[PDB]
């Protein structure tokens, strides 16, 4: 149970600090800076929220020239990376400012790769060549989900082949990421609640593990989880509260940190099951992770019951798995979330279809518990 | 209460992995690698422990040429950095492997600065010039104290001026740090116990703070502290237990991480008081941090009692400060440590002298509580 850890992304955390955009562009861009401002669509949100302008007022404040590129799709297209690469070689862009969420942060990362490369950028997603440099990006995050602002991955889709892929390498690490919890305020309720689940789930998938000798790390993952459990409901009912937003945003960041999860095997079973509820139904990840995970832990409560007893003792102050599973259920409902799939008029109709697609060509699925097709149907019946 | 965080030092954590020395030298040294092996004195310990050879067997395993430099003093001298710089320009050393503890890790860092600089290296400790590059170092840590293996500081002393100084900049960050808990085994008892106190103390100095809105971070610092409290005594009585050593070593690393302490004001009062007990008496830091801190928290128990109630609830499972201060006292004794200065035949003789030297030219000392000369004498009388 050894492990390595790197993460060089600079964290600029806090509020009323919009100068550090400029400052940090100067610090990690060569020569004189000239940047690309990247965002989903035509600035429609970042502008409506007032980030756009205060962004611009930072660049002006620092004599930073800049072209803009827009038109990002929620799952972004190499269509537009080929666009942005042309522009960074054409206009000698020396640095890119991702303003938005993970799917512009993703597109930004892939432009930063090709801006510096001689060949085609797919070869870096194709598993053909391993990029050895990028220009470098700074992110201004508007929504604390998934942590692409601090990761080494980029998730793009080739729509004319519509084969999607990813590229995972230490070059993709942002040079810096601005994190202001104020951006949490304008987020809609059901989307805020699902992002609080994503954080807890990210933590639980690493926590529930067959690994041993993990006490310290157990403690840290417990601490973050417990904070998500305490504050998530408060933020839900006090959306503009900077403190509440700071604990939550900071929790999501730490959840994405391999210092606290350090040499322990993550189980992705709940993720994959949910992936296929979301493939056939219009349903938000986080909401599906609140209906499935309790189903899954109910079905896996016999593998290492001790590590379940521990979980619920540390986090819900109780040694009975049943009582604690229900407290976790109750905590999900305290963020607006109905706990069953029937409640979303999802029926048993495609449980079979979903279970086959989840397993694909494998026979089982999972690490904590190896789960086969009928196992998965049982879990879906538990969550019905 | 905003904050920034960077740390690019690569963590290689674990056991039976001595190849990664070689591997990681290849990865972060230009061209073909040729390195400097740096250590205290003439390899006397690292060799006696068998690190020396398994080091060499990694470099041979990787066709890595290398000169050696030895002769480090516990508080190291620019005498020898001027030596090692000459050799890295002379023999085109492209990378340095610090094998040892913080005072060779320190000397290594200062050689890495000058190897790449045109002028004198003092100017980087003098506050005259701000270095903009180093060659780069890898550390193999033999003792988990102070965390210089992951810091940006280097503490050298000019003995012919015998003015000591430091240089703190993002270039000093090791490229990688090998951390194998096995190195804990051979450490002597009183020195292992004091290093367990250094870790707890490092955490407590950041915990006890006038800052607010720090719940998540409170939780993480509690988690680590609580682990140091649970495992430290076990490691003390089972010195070769890899699990126990892994939690403790990993705790010290995290204690040195500004993700868990994030935008909170550290109080250095206990450090400074202890510094002057150690200036006049032969006494190990960690042991003096176990006699002074309880004295100090007794004397500061009225500032924000709530944050004391919290501390002892989360860490010693009790809401009474007195009961908990005594549990912390008892925990110190459970590692071999007598709790009073009288027990070391330290008398009240220089309490006055020590209090004046601690304050220097300032009138008070501290952030949690402003402590004046008599205040400090009171704390020393509490610890007598
Ligand atoms: N600060 C914010 N306030 C309100 N809505 C936001 C904010 N950030 C993102 N969104 C919205 O959330 C939806 C999906 O999130 P997205 O921005 O694609 O990134 P992620 O992939 O990290 O969730 C988008 O339609 C966008 O409208
Ligand atoms: N793995 C180890 N086993 C035994 N003794 C050690 C080990 N590492 C360091 N020491 C000893 O500890 C003493 C002081 O620690 P030092 O190595 O100077 O670094 P640090 O400054 O981090 O404590 C030295 O005299 C050395 O003999
Ligand atoms: Fe997930
Ligand atoms: Fe200290």
Q: What is the 3-state secondary structure (H, E, C) of A179-247?
A: ECHHHHCCCCHHHHHHHHHHHHHHHHHHHCCCCCCCHHHHHHHHHHHHHHHHHHHHHHHCCCCHHHHHH
Q: 3-state class of B269 per DSSP?
A: helix
Residues in B closer than 8 angstroms to A219, CB to CB, are 223-224, 226-227
Contact by Cβ (8 Å): B302, B160: no
Instruction: Please identify which residue in the block is written with the tokens 């206009």.
Output: A91
Task: Name residues whose C-beta falls within 8 Å of residue A253's C-beta, 6 or more positions apart in sequence.
Answer: A11, A13, A144, A147, A150, A179
Tell which residue, B273, B267, B268, B266, has the closest CA to residue B375.
Answer: B273
- For every residue of B85-126, DSSP letters joined together read HHHHHHTT--EEEEEESHHHHHHHHHHHHHTT-SS-SHHHHT
Tell which residue, A206, A50, A179, has the closest CA to residue A105.
Answer: A179
Going across the sheet that includes B137-141, the strands are A3-5, B10-13, B176-179, B137-141, B95-100, B34-38, B65-69
How far apart are alpha carbons A204 and A228 in whole angstroms? 11
- Select from B39, B40, B45, B289 the residue to mutate for testing ligand 2; criterion: most ligand atoms less than 8 Å from CB: B45
How far apart are alpha carbons A69 and A29 in whole angstroms? 19
Backbone φ and ψ of A324, nearest 5°: -70, -40
Residues in A closer than 8 angstroms to B223, CB to CB, are 216, 219-220, 222-223
The alpha carbon of A114 is separated from its chain's Cα centroid by a whole number of angstroms, namely: 24
Contact A223 B219 (CB under 8 A): yes
Instruction: Please identify which residue in the block is written with the tokens 């830091």.
Output: B285
Does residue B186 line the site of ligand 2, with CB under 6 A? yes
Tell which residue, A288, A293, A291, has the closest CA to residue A276.
Answer: A288
- Select from A39, A45, A147, A248 the residue to mutate for testing ligand 1; criterion: most ligand atoms less than 8 Å from CB: A45
Radius of gyration in angstroms for the set of CA atoms belonging to chain B, rounded to a whole number: 21
Contact A13 B5 (CB under 8 A): yes
The reply, when asked if residue A183 is annotated as ligand binding, is: yes
Rounded to the nearest whole angstrom, what is the distance from the C-alpha of residue B23 to the centroid of ligand 2?
Answer: 26
Q: 3-state class of A98 per DSSP?
A: strand
Task: Measure Cα distances from A38 to A55, A71, A105, A110, A154 in Å.
Answer: 12, 9, 8, 12, 15
Q: 3-state class of A8 per DSSP?
A: coil
Residues in B closer than 8 angstroms to A259, CB to CB, are 254, 257, 259
Q: 3-state class of A338 per DSSP?
A: coil
Token pair, residue A30, equals: 């060569």
Residue of chain A whose Cα is closest to the Cα of B246: A213
* Residues 68-87 (B) with a CB less than 8 A from some CB of A: none
Contact B263 A17 (CB under 8 A): no
How far apart are alpha carbons A55 and B177 in whole angstroms? 38
Contact B226 A243 (CB under 8 A): no
Contact A227 B216 (CB under 8 A): yes
Contact A219 B213 (CB under 8 A): no
Contact B224 A219 (CB under 8 A): yes
* Residues 227-256 (A) with a CB less than 8 A from some CB of B: 227, 230-231, 242-243, 246-247, 250-251, 254
Chain B: closest CA distance from residue A374 (Å): 38
Task: Please compute, for residue A237, the number of CA atoms within 13 A of its CA located in the half-sphere on the CB side.
Answer: 8
How far apart are alpha carbons A372 and A361 in whole angstroms? 12
Contact B219 A227 (CB under 8 A): yes
Instruction: Provide the b/e sequence for B6-45 (b: ≥16 CB within 10 Å).
Output: bbbbbbbbbeeebebbbebbeebbeeebbbbbbbbeebeb
Atom of ligand 2 nearest to the CA of B191: 12
Question: Could you tell me where the DSSP H helices lie in B238-284?
Answer: 242-255, 269-280
Contact B2 A17 (CB under 8 A): yes
How far apart are alpha carbons B102 and B79 in whole angstroms? 17
Instruction: Please identify which residue in the block is written with the tokens 């040729």.
Output: B34
Contact A3 B10 (CB under 8 A): no
Dihedral in degrees, nearest 10, Cα atoms A246, A139, A167, A266? -10
Which of A7, A223, A243 shows the shortest C-beta gap to B223?
A: A223
Please report which ligand is nearest the Cα atom of A98. 1
Question: Could you tell me where the DSSP H helices lie in chain B?
Answer: 19-28, 44-48, 51-60, 78-90, 102-114, 122-125, 189-207, 215-237, 242-255, 269-280, 285-299, 305-316, 321-333, 351-359, 373-382
The phi-psi region of residue A71 (left if phi > 0; otherwise alpha if psi is between -120 and 50; otherwise beta) is left
Contact by Cβ (8 Å): A233, A193: no
Please report which ligand is nearest the Cα atom of A195. 1
Token pair, residue A11, equals: 């964290």
Which of A2, A12, A246 shows the shortest C-beta gap to B17?
A: A2
The reply, when asked if residue A94 is annotated as ligand binding, is: no
Does residue B187 line the site of ligand 2, with CB under 6 A? yes
The reply, when asked if residue A151 is annotated as ligand binding, is: yes
| C-alpha triplet B142, B158, B287: angle, nearest 5° | 45
Resolution (angstroms) stands at 2.7
Token pair, residue B163, equals: 């003015």
The reply, when asked if residue A112 is annotated as ligand binding, is: no
A interface test, pick of B212, B213, B223, B260 with most A CB neighbours within 10 Å: B223
Which of B11, B224, B259 shows the shortest C-beta gap to A254?
A: B259
How far apart are alpha carbons A373 and A354 in whole angstroms? 9
How far apart are alpha carbons A157 and A167 in whole angstroms? 11
Task: Please compute, for residue A218, the number of CA atoms within 13 A of its CA located in the half-sphere on the CB side.
Answer: 21
Ligand 1: residues whose CB is within 6 Å?
A 45, 74, 100-103, 142-143, 145-146, 183, 186-187, 191
Residue of chain B whose Cα is closest to the Cα of A15: B2
Flag whether residue B126 sits within 8 Å of chain A, measured between CB atoms. no
How far apart are alpha carbons B22 and B24 in whole angstroms? 6
How far apart are alpha carbons B257 and B351 in whole angstroms? 34
Q: 3-state class of A334 per DSSP?
A: coil
Task: Name residues whose C-beta falls within 8 Å of residue B68's C-beta, 6 or more positions apart in sequence.
Answer: B36, B37, B38, B39, B43
Neighbours of B224 (CB within 10 A): 28
Residues in A closer than 8 angstroms to B7, CB to CB, are 7-8
DSSP letter, residue B75: S
| C-alpha triplet B377, B383, B384: angle, nearest 5° | 85
Does residue B101 line the site of ligand 2, with CB under 6 A? yes
Which of A216, A227, A259 shows the shortest C-beta gap to B257?
A: A259
Would the CA dihedral through B66, B97, B54, B42 be positive or negative?
A: positive
Chain B: closest CA distance from residue A216 (Å): 6
Instruction: Please identify which residue in the block is written with the tokens 């038109």.
Output: A71
Residues in B closer than 8 angstroms to A313, CB to CB, are none
Does residue B252 line the site of ligand 2, with CB under 6 A? no
Contact by Cβ (8 Å): B110, B96: no
Task: Measure Cα distances from A167 to A75, A106, A107, A114, A120 in Å.
Answer: 15, 10, 12, 12, 14
Judged on CB neighbours under 10 Å (0-12, 13-18, 19+), A223 is buried
């Amino acid at each position: 149970d050894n492990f390595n850890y790197k993460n060089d992304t600079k964290i600029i955390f806090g509020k009323d600090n919009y100068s550090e955009i400029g400052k940090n562009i100067k610090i990690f861009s060569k020569k004189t800076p000239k940047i690309l401002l990247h965002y989903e669509a035509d600035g429609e949100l970042i502008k409506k929220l007032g980030i756009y302008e205060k962004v611009i007022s930072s660049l002006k404040e620092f004599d930073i020239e800049f072209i803009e590129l827009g038109g990002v799709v929620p799952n972004p297209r190499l269509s537009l990376v080929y666009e942005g690469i042309k522009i960074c070689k054409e206009e000698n862009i020396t640095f890119i400012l991702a303003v938005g969420g993970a799917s512009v942060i993703d597109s930004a990362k892939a432009i930063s790769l090709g801006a510096v490369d001689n060949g085609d950028v797919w070869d870096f997603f194709t598993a053909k060549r391993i990029p050895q440099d990028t220009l470098g990006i700074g992110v201004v995050l508007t929504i604390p989900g998934a942590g692409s602002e601090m990761s080494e991955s980029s998730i793009i889709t080739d729509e004319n082949k519509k084969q999607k892929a990813v590229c995972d390498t230490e070059v993709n690490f942002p040079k810096f990421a601005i994190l202001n919890p104020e951006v949490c305020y304008t987020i809609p309720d059901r989307l805020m609640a699902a992002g609080i689940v994503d954080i807890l789930s990210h933590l639980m998938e690493r926590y529930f593990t067959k690994s041993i000798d993990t006490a310290l790390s157990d403690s840290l993952i417990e601490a973050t989880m417990k904070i998500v459990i305490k504050y998530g409901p408060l933020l839900m009912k006090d959306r503009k509260n900077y403190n509440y937003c700071s604990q939550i945003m900071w929790a999501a960041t730490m959840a994405h940190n391999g210092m606290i999860a350090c040499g322990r095997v993550a189980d992705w079973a709940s993720h994959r099951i949910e992936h296929e509820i979301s493939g056939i139904y219009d349903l938000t990840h986080g909401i599906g992770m609140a209906i499935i995970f309790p189903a899954w832990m109910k079905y896996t409560k016999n593998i290492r019951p001790q590590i379940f007893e521990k979980f619920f003792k540390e986090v819900f102050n109780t040694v009975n798995i049943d009582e604690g599973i229900n407290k976790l259920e109750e905590f999900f409902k305290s963020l607006g979330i109905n706990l069953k799939l029937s409640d979303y008029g999802i029926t048993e109709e495609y449980f079979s279809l979903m279970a086959e697609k989840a397993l694909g060509n494998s026979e089982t699925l999972g690490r904590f518990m190896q789960l086969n097709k009928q196992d998965i149907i049982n879990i879906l019946n538990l969550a019905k």
